[PDB]
Design a protein around this ligand. Sequence first.
Ligand code: 58P
Length: 466
Amino acid sequence: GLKAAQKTLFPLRSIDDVVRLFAAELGREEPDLVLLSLVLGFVEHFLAVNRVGLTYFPVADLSIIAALYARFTAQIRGAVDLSLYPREGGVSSRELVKKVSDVIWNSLSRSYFKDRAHIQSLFSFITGTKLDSSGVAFAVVGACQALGLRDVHLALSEDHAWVVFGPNGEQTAEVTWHGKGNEDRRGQTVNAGVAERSWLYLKGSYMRCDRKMEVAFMVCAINPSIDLHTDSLELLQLQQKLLWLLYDLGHLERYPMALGNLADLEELEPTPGRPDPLTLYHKGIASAKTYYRDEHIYPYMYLAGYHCRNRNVREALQAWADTATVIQDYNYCREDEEIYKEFFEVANDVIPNLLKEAASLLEAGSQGSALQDPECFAHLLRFYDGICKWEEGSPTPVLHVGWATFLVQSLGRFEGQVRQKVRIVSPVLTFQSEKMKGMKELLVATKINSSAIKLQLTAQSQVQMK
Ligand SMILES: N#Cc1cc2cc(CN3CCC(Nc4ncnc5sc(CC(F)(F)F)cc45)CC3)ccc2n1C[C@H](O)CO
C-alpha cells in the first residue's frame, strides 16, 4: 500500500523489531517484498556501510521507510503502463516482464563495480542506483508484485537468477546479466541452458520461489561484512534470527542453501535449543534430494567446508566425493566457471593443505588418521572420478596438467599399503569415468608413477621428443 496494518510496528528500534516486521509480513496474504528489502537495506547500510554515529541500532522511522517505498513505487508505476499489456488469465505476458526488467536495468548507474558488497537491496537501487546481478532479478520481482502481477516469481540456480511467470507459472524469462563478458539474454527463456545440461540451469531442477522463498532469498542476501576482517555482529544476529523465523514457518523446506547459511551462522554463534550445524547441513542435503533430484552442489560443499574447518578429514573427503557424484551428470558449459572454480580450489588448494597437515600429524603419531584409512583414499578417488565423468561429453574440457601435480601429490599422501586395500570393481569402489578406470593400474604402486598419471589424467598423447 503501504497499508495501515503494515505501518503499526514502526519505528523499528532493534533487531527484534525487524524480526517482528518480518513475522507480521510473513503472516500476511503476501509479504511485501519492497517494504522488506528497503528495511533490510536501510539497516545494513547503517550497520555495515556507514556506522558513524551508531550507538545501538539504526532506528528505522516510518517516515523514512515510507518515503523510500514511495520513490520505488512512483518509479515503477510511472514507467510501466499496465494498460499497454492486458493480462489474460490473471497472468502476465513476456512483454510485460521484459518491460519491467528494462525499467530496472535502465535506472542503473552507467559504470560501477558489479561485484561489490551491499548493492543487493532496493535500498541500494533507490539511494545508489546500483544493483548486483541477482539484485536486478529480485527487484524485477518486487516491482511486479508492486504492480499486482501475482504470477511473477524469482527463479534461482546456484549461480544465477531469473523469473517464472505466465500460465501455470510455466514460462521463464531472463531479466538480468550473468557473469562478466557474457552477452545478455534478457527476455529469452532458459530452455537452451536446461537442454544443454549445464550446471548454471541445474537440468531444470532450479528453485521456483513462492513469495515466502523470495523473503528467504533477501534474508540470505544480507551481507554482514563491514570489511575483509570484520563482520557486523548486529547483522549476523539479524540474519540468523530471520532464518530461524523462516525455518520455523516452513519456508526453508525447499531452500537448501539457506539451510547451509543458517548452519554456518550456528557454527559461528550457536543458538541454545536449536539443531547443531551438522544437522542443518544434512537437512540442506535432504532438501536437495527431496525437491531437486539431488542435482545441487552447494549442499555438499557447505557440509565439506564445515568438516574441513573442524579438521574432520574423513567426512570432508566424503562430502567432496559427494559433490563430484552430483557434478558427474552435468556437461561443463560456458558460463559454468564458478563451479569449475570451486572444484579447482578444492582439488588443488584445500585438499592438499588438509592432507599436508594430516601427514604432519601422522608423523607425530596420530591414530585413526584418514591417511591410514582406505575408505578415505576411496573418497579421494571418487572425487576425481566424478570430475573426470563431468568432463565426458562436455563441450569444453575440465582437466589439464595443472591438476595433475596435485593429484600425484594427494595420492602419495597415502601409503601404498593403505592404497592397496581399496578394491576397484567393474573398501570397494566403482569408477564411472574412463579416465579413472585406466588409472586403476597405477593407484597401488609404492611409488606412484607420476608421468603415467599425468598422461592418463590429461589424456596427453605424447612425451617429450628429446
Ligand atoms: N568445501 C567447501 C566450500 C564451502 C563453500 C561455501 C560457499 C558459500 N556460498 C555458497 C553459495 C551461496 N549462494 C547462494 N546462497 C543462497 N541463495 C542463493 S540464490 C543464488 C543464485 C543467485 F545469486 F541468486 F544468482 C546463490 C545463492 C553463497 C555462499 C562457497 C564455497 C564453498 N566451498 C568451496 C571452497 O570455497 C573452495 O575454496
